[PDB]
């Protein structure tokens, strides 16, 4: 009874069959497969060496010789030439597997890009059919000038890093050296957002207050009140005097360390504000909200220059936003786990990055002008290169705990990461330098000092703490 | 299907194996055989409905059948069959050489036969003259 092995495709003298598949195998081959993988090679069911039935009928007889095979050395010649084809066939398979996986990635990319067109066109059609169904009778020049100034002044820093930069061997010895508590009421605990400017800092809380605090003077500098709901984000201006704050009551309010009153209120959002970002010159503030609009506004007068939906014709929660530090483009991250890059000059999408598997709670841009990082509830962190709009490297925690915050250092040598624990990556190596878990709850903000000489973090644990070596 | 039933001698469309069997049976054959006989057609083991498993082909990953006739296993096989033949040939040659070499070693009388001839002829040379 002629039989052939499902593993090798050759005849077999000893056919055998697994109890968990209909396929037939050569005994010594399937046993070695079971010995490595413990499973059926074709149905992938669990399989053991005793679950085999022996097809003990008469096996396949020898093939006839080729006429050249009638001599022992010509059999050795024939065996050598046979082996070279078998080797090259095996090499062709691993080449073909690389090509197939390469083409599948491109194919899925093109299909994904096509679904974006489908979604945009489907909404245009719905709005058109809705209209039928209810039918009744120098700013742009300044930015390039400023961005080219900003990106050109960077070039010396890109060629040489500061000589005062803290070493990796120093950052490996980071320890808790300051702790501050009681900044917000224990009845509605946790710092919801933080920003720093040297030893100066600004904090939000669930208690509706905004408090400006100096973690070197151990004292409150000023307190601001008037928000109807909890504070989600804050920004401390480079002038050390102006303070910016955003509330879940859909309004942004602006404050001064010198003043007991609201410097401005910016009625521009229809929904709770989730994240905000500061332009590199400090002249203007950018914001995002659950209403899916980004909006760009004057910090002082509250007038808005332009406003466009992150996903026109749809509502999607936007969870992170940040300017590229040259200030002409900014990245946005939303609950669809799409990251969209916008050009402020055209006020249009410059790039779009499908990436993470869950909502992008944080985005960071490097002051080298080309590394980008995005962080998500799925517990991965990924590095992006804007020079080709591509990924470089990925890092993750295997427990998939959400990451709430990210920050590059001011030189863009280090990346701080915050979730259920505190971590810092040296980005050029993409290696974890240290991990710290001293907070008893989720981390809510990461910031760096000058020359990476200090690290600042906040948490729902009612504490603000600083680490140094 | 290319499997031929060991009992009916015709090609299957429903191949079945059981743990006490070895030749292939058809499903539509063995179930009536269980009902009348209850007995394995070849091994005469007891048959039961939980023993039978049915074969299938064309699943994912299944290697393509090599039809080119040459293969590494078959060449190593026939090289092994050459070696078995040559050693059994060499053994019977070595056996024959041992037997022939043995008896010619025992047959080495030439020096002692010569001394007997010398002894005989020297007797003759006296017997030829005492008359």
């Amino acid at each position: 009874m002629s039989f052939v092995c499902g593993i090798s495709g050759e005849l077999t003298e000893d056919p055998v069959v697994s109890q968990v598949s209909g396929h037939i195998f050569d005994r010594r081959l399937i046993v070695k497969f079971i010995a490595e993988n413990g499973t059926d090679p074709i149905s992938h069911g669990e399989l053991s060496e005793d679950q085999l039935v022996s097809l003990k009928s008469g096996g396949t007889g020898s093939a006839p010789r080729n006429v050249s095979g009638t001599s022992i050395p010509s059999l050795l010649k024939m065996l050598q030439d046979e082996w070279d084809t078998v080797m090259l066939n095996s090499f062709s398979l691993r080449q073909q597997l690389q090509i197939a996986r390469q083409e599948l990635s491109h194919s899925l990319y093109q299909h994904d890009a096509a679904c974006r067109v489908i979604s945009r066109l489907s909404k245009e059609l719905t709005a058109a059919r809705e209209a039928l169904s209810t039918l009744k009778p120098a700013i742009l020049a300044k930015l390039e000038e400023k961005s080219k100034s900003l990106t050109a002044e960077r070039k010396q820093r890109g060629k040489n890093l500061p000589e005062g930069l803290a070493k990796t061997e120093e950052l490996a010895e980071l320890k808790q050296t300051a702790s501050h508590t009681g900044i917000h009421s224990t009845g509605t605990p946790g710092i919801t957002a933080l920003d720093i400017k040297g030893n100066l800092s600004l904090t939000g809380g669930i208690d509706k207050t905004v408090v400006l605090y100096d973690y070197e003077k151990e004292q409150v500098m000023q307190t601001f009140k008037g928000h109807n709901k909890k504070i989600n984000a804050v920004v401390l201006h480079p002038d050390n005097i102006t303070a910016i704050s955003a509330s879940a009551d859909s309004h942004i309010r602006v404050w001064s360390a010198t003043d007991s009153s609201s410097k401005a209120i910016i009625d521009v959002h229809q929904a709770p504000v989730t994240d905000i970002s500061l332009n590199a010159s400090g002249d203007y503030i950018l914001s995002a909200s659950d209403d899916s609009y980004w909006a760009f506004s004057d910090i002082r007068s509250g007038k808005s220059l332009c406003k466009v939906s992150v996903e026109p014709g749809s509502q999607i929660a936007v969870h992170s936003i940040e300017f590229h530090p040259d200030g002409l483009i900014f990245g946005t991250g939303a609950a669809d786990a799409v990251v969209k890059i916008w050009d402020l000059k055209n006020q249009t999408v410059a790039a779009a990055f499908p990436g993470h598997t869950a909502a992008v709670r944080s985005i960071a841009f490097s002051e080298n002008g080309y590394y980008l990082a995005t962080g998500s509830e799925d517990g991965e962190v990924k590095l992006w290169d804007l020079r080709k709009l591509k990924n470089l490297k990925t890092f993750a925690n295997e427990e998939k705990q959400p990451i709430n915050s990210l920050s590059f250092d001011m030189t863009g040598t280090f990346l701080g990461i915050g979730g259920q624990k505190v971590q810092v990556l040296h980005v050029k190596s993409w290696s974890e330098v240290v991990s710290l878990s001293d907070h008893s709850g989720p981390v809510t903000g990461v910031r760096f000092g000058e020359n990476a000489r200090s690290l600042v973090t906040c948490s729902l644990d009612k504490s603000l703490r600083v680490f140094s070596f | 299907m290319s499997f031929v039933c060991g009992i009916s001698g015709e090609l299957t469309e429903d191949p079945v194996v059981s743990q006490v069997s070895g030749h292939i049976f058809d499903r539509r054959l063995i179930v009536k055989f269980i009902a009348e006989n209850g007995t394995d057609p070849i091994s005469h083991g007891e048959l039961s409905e939980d023993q039978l498993v049915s074969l299938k082909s064309g699943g994912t990953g299944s290697a393509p059948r090599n039809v080119s006739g040459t293969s590494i296993p078959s060449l190593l096989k026939m090289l092994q069959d050459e070696w078995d033949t040559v050693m059994l040939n060499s053994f019977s040659l070595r056996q024959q050489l041992q037997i022939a070499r043995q008896e010619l070693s025992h047959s080495l009388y030439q020096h002692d036969a010569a001394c007997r001839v010398i002894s005989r002829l020297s007797k003759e040379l006296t017997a030829a003259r005492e008359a």
């Binding site: 007889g61 020898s62 006839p64 010789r65 | 026939m78 069959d81």
Partner: peptide, 26 residues
């Protein structure tokens, strides 16, 4: 061991006897 497939040669010869000839056993 090599030309054992001659068993099928006599089966082909058998087929020429079973076709175009007498009854099989009963």
């Amino acid at each position: 061991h090599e030309y054992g497939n001659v068993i099928k040669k006599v089966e082909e010869m058998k087929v020429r006897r079973e076709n175009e000839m007498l009854a099989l056993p009963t």
